[PDB]
Design a binder for these strands. Structure first.
Lengths: 201, 125, 73, 180, 185, 272, 103
RNA sequence: AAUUUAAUUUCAAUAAAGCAAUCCCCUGAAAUUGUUUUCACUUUCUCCCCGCACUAAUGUGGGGAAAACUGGCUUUAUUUCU
RNA sequence: CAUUUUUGGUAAGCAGAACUGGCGAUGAGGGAUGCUCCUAACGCUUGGAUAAGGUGCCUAAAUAUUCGCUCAUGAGAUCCCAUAAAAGGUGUUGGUUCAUAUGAACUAGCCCUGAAAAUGGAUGGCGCUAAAGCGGAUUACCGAUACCAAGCCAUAAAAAGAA
RNA sequence: AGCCAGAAACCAUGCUGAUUAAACAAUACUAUCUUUUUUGUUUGCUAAUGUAAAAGAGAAAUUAUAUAUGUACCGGUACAUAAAUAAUCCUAUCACCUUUUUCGUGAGCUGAGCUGUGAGCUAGGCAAUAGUUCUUUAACAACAAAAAAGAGCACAAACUGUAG
């Protein structure tokens, strides 16, 4: 709601719920950068999802497929179409809401060093029972011909090496700050030190 | 919405429009009651040319009163202003459209002496 | 984590005598989540002067700490 | 007390008799307990039973007494056995179920919920024939037998749930199912 | 519905077992087998010092009970495999044409030639870890052996499926390669 | 009701819309796939059509009715002046496709190449290319090193020498040729070594090779449906002409379905 | 640093809708960290300010302001109904609104 | 956020005493409706015996005992300890 | 035209009746969508509180609470109302009757099979499986031109009037 | 529950279009142009304004979900570390000029000396004062004037015919 941009690590989120939650925020006016959409989960068995999608692919106008419903095969764009469904996009306020959303697979560069959030209400592990099948959107995308899954995976691995280096440095930095703080704690006047101590800082 | 000012509440503004006068030239703009076997407007369909009806009417203790707070009286001769000296606080003169400038001036002058408001004051000079 | 060794049957009088005696609440308070809980309750309830006071003390801490870091090189 | 976990099923003791006439100087007096969502509802259910079993209706009879029963020891466990008559879409069946609860009232509330869930019985379609507290050694259904074991304990494995204050729309990192 | 279900599985003498969050691993004399179970709810607990494995389930339903038995048996097969490899004896049967079995590639790739006189080669590459040896004893026997109970069976199944004929009465024409004997080395 | 007898539809759907090509020059839609083991080498070559002749060839092929005898076959002649390589291009793979990283050029490019980056060579002051061409060799090496480190496909910029032909035009044809072969380093080495020199066909092909040919078809302007799609003519008696289709679709759905062929452009199509 | 707010941040939602019918008399406001009926109730008597910018000067300045009042909570989830002197223009949906400390 | 005196089988501590042991408040199962009698029902961080570590279980499977800590009752005071 | 009663006709958004209510001549809120269904009948306004109906997003209210059931390689999802049966099922869930903790026999919940049609395609759409499904129960809330309070208008009647 | 082989079917690959994406990249060459400061933007024209989002718009591990993460040995082992997680942490108000002393960076000279700028310690006496609130004019971007500082293509025409 009140921040300039939420960046969302879509990994482990359930498609519909993530879309619905995103849509309400977009309508209100909060900007949303949806990243890493390939590990969006759709619920249920893979074969079922593929079959349903195959029927969606099958649907086309008789007259002229140029003006047929657009199919798309790219996971981020799948999420985007679903978000459009959950907004009143033929209106003008609605059109602005759709525009406010930006989606991308993997993580591009200006989003590399900004905090990813997770929506806990739409997290898979807290919403699908553990004996009931589930399915990765990226896998679904590969099966219906997206063919850009291996490349994204290669990129994820690369980012992780960068992340681990940054994190290791950061943890070390936190240690330096903590060490200085404890040492110079007893250079503070008693009364101020006591108040600070009282609230455990 | 309601257009309050002080003691004067008028409920409605935007002068009621004859249905269809938007989209045919021949249809006159001033009101007409639609008759019609079935037509939206008579039938009071949602959001379309809301029909006037009497209950909209101004309050009966303020029925005709100008924002002047004085009743309008049309005047074409100085003799006709002979009554309105006794109501100078509650009626205001308007000088009639026809009245020529020499006579009009005289009427303005008489009114000023008599301490009564003159609404179309600067007319034809 | 914490648990008392009470019988299944137990009712409130025996429970009061036992819970106090083995001091289990104290153990919870000493534990990290309990410690954070008591700090939180105070921090929520804190008065206007106290809110300023923490800022002043923290600002003083920042000055000393920054100076030490600058020294350290 | 928590309203959210509240139920409104109570037990009412009802006593009634037929209006006296030249033919019947002293009538046969009937008492029953009836599980109901209020006292009027209790009366109505009692009247329906009066019509079904005896020869009586509200119009030619009179209520002698109406009083609420409430559990004597509402904070100690009992094993309640219930016998029901219900109607299905094809026809009619008798059935016997067991419930662990804290009062008769609790047992009936669960039972109505169960009968709706497993049998699609609506409240109209259920008829209580006898509910009584049954000894632990005489229990007949496996899920109640399992509870009655000597040193009952198990791990919690239900998902977290929490107030509107904390159930926010954005979070620092993925929360954990695990718990300690 | 039921509160507790358990099972206790002995460990043979030679095995090096090492579970961790439903990634079970068994090593032994004839190689290392890893076989995931983190698809399933299950409280596997390990017991290296005194041997045995304990599988325990909380709040099962009959589906869960079935799973507990399934996991334990499968684990026991894995121990059996690393201790003493599985030998699946497959006899090659012919009424008329002599079915020519050529083993190449270090006991991988069995090439089958001359099936019903078709004058064409059927190649069936094996699963990894799977020896395809021939018997020294009775001439038409062919040995499928390995550590993994699954891979040897799948290799055998693949061989069996690969051979058999089409559009003739299967009551009459019996030629093809069949599984005789399930044993260990 | 169903049509009384059934035939395949006239003309393939697979090339619709049958509009004019963007460009006189052909375009490779896709290259052969990069098998790592083979040495670096060119995949394509540019040429001009000169005409057709016939040839007489002796046939080995056994079990054929034709067998031993010589046969007469039509054949095409394609003049191939040696290509000149002028630039190196490095592409990198992204989820949103190939994006060019950088391009490195030779230290000279001839007038015939230069003419293509103008429309009006005579009128111009011919000021194109000269200052970039100057910039020193360290700069080129730095870009090459960047390409070397990251790029996943390397392609070479080649051009025709139309003065070594009898054709009217002097604006050369520039075309990109992908290199398939070894390591990125070897690929880069091979193009650098080649660079400003001239490349003849014998370096790219071998005798007896099987080849794919990409060319834009013969133009005819706008042609009638019969000619353009092969439709059988209507009977003579017909009042408003005969050389046109007799139905363009059912009543429902209430639009002209695209699949019915109509009059229009024929030729100047891309074809592989 | 300078000019610290002393007001709670907010977002002007829709009008007081119902499905396919519109009432412009009341605006719906979400307040920065309000989330429940009970928590919302704390702000009920308080003053609201919608401040906005325009391109050319009015009273010599580029800012004008419409004044309102919080007046009742709405639903469970802490949304509030706010009544202004003049109807809020709907183009300001999703814009910022100020919930002051007074009265 | 509360509040008065009623009514409706409410309760619970407190701290001194006591009472009964498969006992008790209760609740079971049995011999024109009362009523009485039989034997059935508690704990346990107790002890013993077999299985000796056998468990999901910092314990345990089975088989026995023990007690009144625990529960239940009877008294006598007490209600801002609760 | 609808319920209920009803005659002809295989049936029919078919033909003909009975009682009542509608609709016609009637908006408004709900039923996604609609002459007839539900709610409720309409002067102009302000505030209040609801009905019918809802409360994942489209869409205003709950990603509410509470106990069940349900996986579907053509799930299911709202009166009228927009199809589905006989017959099967070692699918799971409860029952009930028998026998010596298993084999038998029945039973009814969901589910599965039975289940085939033409422009592309319709729980209203996106979607949904720890349901936003199905069956309950519990609250809280949102929700009309109806309701309450108040103003203003006309109409109708009533009080009441010849410094 | 876990898996495997398997069809003219499905999807790629392939091939066609891609002002079907009001899509886009690289490169060649080119038209005062760029930076800072100031004031302003209260004959059709010849100075000139817009914001769907400023009021602290603060927050780069990563992986699970019936366990994770480091570290050390050799995915195994051992030991720590998170386990209401943003229910946290971060980060702001000490104006002024003057007295005392300590520590960082840019600029001038060949690891050092010096000045400007940032941070601190020590001491001083020094400012704020509109009659009760009516947006707390405070952000970002765009422009125009003024000074100061630095710097050739295309279309037509004729020709073509691989096109029409």
């Amino acid at each position: 709601m009140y921040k300039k941009e939420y960046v969302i690590d879509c990994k482990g989120h359930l498609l519909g719920r993530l879309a619905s939650l995103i849509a309400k925020e977009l309508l209100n006016g909060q900007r949303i950068v949806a990243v890493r959409c390939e590990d969006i989960n759709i619920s249920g068995s893979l074969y079922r999802n593929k079959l349903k999608y195959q029927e969606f692919l099958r649907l086309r106008t008789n007259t002229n497929p140029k003006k047929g419903p657009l199919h798309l095969r790219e996971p981020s764009k799948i999420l985007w179409r679903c978000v459009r469904g959950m907004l009143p996009h033929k209106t003008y306020k609605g059109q602005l809401a759709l525009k406010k959303l930006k989606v991308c697979v993997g993580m591009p560069a200006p989003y590399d060093k900004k905090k990813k959030y997770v929506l806990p209400s739409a997290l898979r592990a807290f919403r699908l029972k553990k004996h009931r099948r589930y399915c990765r959107l990226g896998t679904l995308s590969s099966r219906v011909g997206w063919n850009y899954d291996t490349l994204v995976k290669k990129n994820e691995v690369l980012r992780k090496q960068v992340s681990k280096a940054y994190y290791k440095k950061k943890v070390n930095n936190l240690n330096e700050k903590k060490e200085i703080k404890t040492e110079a704690l007893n250079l503070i006047n008693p009364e101020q030190r006591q108040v600070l101590e009282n609230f455990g800082y | 919405a309601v257009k309050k000012v002080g003691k004067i509440i008028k409920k409605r503004t935007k002068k009621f429009t004859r249905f269809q006068s938007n989209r045919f030239m021949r249809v006159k703009p001033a009101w007409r009651k639609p008759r019609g076997i079935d037509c939206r407007v008579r039938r009071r369909y949602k959001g379309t040319n809301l029909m006037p009806s009497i209950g909209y009417g101004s309050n009966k203790k303020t029925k005709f009163l100008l924002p002047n707070n004085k009743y309008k009286y049309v005047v074409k001769n100085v003799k006709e202003m002979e009554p309105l000296i006794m109501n100078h606080t509650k009626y205001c003169v308007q000088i009639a459209h026809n009245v020529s400038s020499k006579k009009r001036k005289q009427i303005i002058e008489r009114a000023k002496q008599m301490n009564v408001s003159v609404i179309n004051a600067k007319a034809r000079l | 984590k914490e648990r008392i060794k009470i019988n299944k049957n137990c009712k409130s009088g025996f429970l009061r005598k036992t819970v106090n005696s083995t001091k289990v609440l104290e153990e919870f308070n000493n534990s990290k989540l309990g410690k954070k809980m008591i700090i939180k309750k105070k921090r929520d309830e804190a008065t206007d002067f106290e809110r300023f006071q923490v800022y002043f003390a923290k600002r003083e801490l920042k000055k000393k700490m920054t100076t030490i870091k600058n020294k350290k090189n | 007390i928590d309203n959210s976990l509240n139920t409104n099923i109570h037990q009412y003791h009802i006593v009634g008799r037929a209006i006296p006439t030249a033919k019947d100087k002293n009538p046969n007096v009937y008492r029953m307990c009836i599980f109901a969502k209020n006292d009027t509802n209790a009366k109505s259910r009692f009247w329906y039973f009066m019509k079904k079993i005896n020869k009586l209706k509200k119009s030619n009879g009179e209520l002698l007494a109406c009083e609420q029963i409430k559990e004597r020891f509402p904070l100690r466990v009992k094993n309640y056995g219930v016998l029901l008559r219900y109607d299905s879409r094809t026809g009619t069946h008798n059935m016997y179920k067991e419930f662990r609860d804290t009062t008769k009232e609790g047992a009936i509330a669960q039972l109505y919920s169960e009968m709706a869930g497993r049998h699609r019985a609506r409240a109209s379609s259920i008829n209580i024939i006898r509910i009584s507290e049954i000894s632990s050694s005489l229990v007949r259904r496996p899920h109640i037998k399992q509870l009655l074991k000597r040193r009952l304990r198990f791990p919690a494995l239900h998902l977290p749930t929490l107030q509107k204050e904390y159930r926010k729309k954005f979070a620092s990192k993925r929360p954990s199912t695990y718990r300690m | 519905k039921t509160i507790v279900s358990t099972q206790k599985v002995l460990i043979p003498e030679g095995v090096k077992v090492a579970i961790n969050a439903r990634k079970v691993t068994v090593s032994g004399k004839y190689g290392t087998l890893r076989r995931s179970f983190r698809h399933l709810p299950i409280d596997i607990r390990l017991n290296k010092l005194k041997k045995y494995i304990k599988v325990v389930m909380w709040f099962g339903v009959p589906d869960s009970l079935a799973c507990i038995r399934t996991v334990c048996t499968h684990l026991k097969n894995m121990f059996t495999g690393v201790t003493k490899k599985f030998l699946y004896k497959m006899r090659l049967v012919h009424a008329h044409f002599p079915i020519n079995s050529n083993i190449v590639d270090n006991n991988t790739r069995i090439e089958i030639r001359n099936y019903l006189g078709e004058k064409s080669v059927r190649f069936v590459k094996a699963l990894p870890g799977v020896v395809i040896e021939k018997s020294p004893n009775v001439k038409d026997e062919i040995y499928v052996s390995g550590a993994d109970i699954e891979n040897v069976s799948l290799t055998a199944a693949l061989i069996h499926q690969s051979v058999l004929c089409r559009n003739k009465d299967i009551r009459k024409f019996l030629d093809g390669i069949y599984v005789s004997e399930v044993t260990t080395v | 009701s169903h049509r009384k007898f059934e035939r395949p539809r006239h003309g393939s759907l697979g090339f619709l819309p049958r509009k004019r090509c963007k460009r006189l020059r052909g375009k490779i839609r896709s290259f052969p796939k990069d098998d790592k083991e083979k040495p670096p080498h060119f995949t394509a070559f540019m040429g001009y059509k000169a005409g057709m002749t016939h040839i007489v060839r002796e046939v080995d092929k056994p079990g054929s009715k034709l067998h031993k005898k010589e046969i007469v076959e039509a054949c095409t002649i394609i003049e191939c002046a040696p290509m000149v390589v002028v630039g190196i291009v490095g592409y990198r793979e992204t989820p949103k496709g190939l994006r060019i990283l950088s391009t490195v050029w030779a230290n000279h490019v001839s007038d015939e190449f230069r003419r293509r980056y103008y429309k009006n060579w005579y009128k111009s002051e011919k000021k194109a290319f000269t200052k970039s061409l100057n910039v020193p060799e360290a700069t080129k090496n730095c870009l090459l090193k960047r390409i070397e480190k990251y790029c996943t496909v390397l392609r070479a910029i080649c051009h025709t020498q139309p003065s070594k032909t009898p054709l009217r035009m002097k604006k050369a044809h520039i075309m990109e040729v992908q290199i398939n072969g070894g390591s990125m380093k070897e690929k880069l080495e091979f193009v650098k070594e080649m660079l400003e020199k001239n490349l003849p066909v014998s370096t790219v092909f071998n005798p007896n090779e099987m080849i794919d040919v990409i060319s834009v078809t013969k133009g005819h302007g706008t042609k009638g449906v019969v000619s353009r799609y092969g439709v059988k003519r209507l009977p003579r008696k017909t009042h408003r002409g005969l050389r046109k289709v007799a139905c363009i679709g059912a009543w429902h759905p209430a639009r002209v379905q695209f699949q019915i062929p109509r009059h229009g452009q024929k030729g100047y199509f891309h074809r592989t | 640093l300078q000019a610290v707010r002393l007001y709670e941040k907010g977002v002007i939602l829709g009008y007081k809708r119902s499905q396919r019918n519109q009432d412009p008399n009341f605006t719906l406001i979400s307040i920065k960290n309000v989330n429940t009926k009970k928590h919302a109730q704390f702000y009920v008597g308080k003053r609201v300010a919608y401040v906005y910018r325009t391109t050319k000067h009015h009273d010599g300045v580029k800012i004008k302001c419409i004044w309102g009042k919080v007046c009742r909570t709405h639903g469970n989830s802490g949304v509030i109904r706010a009544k202004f002197k003049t109807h809020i223009p709907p183009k300001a949906f999703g814009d910022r609104v100020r919930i002051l400390m007074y009265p």
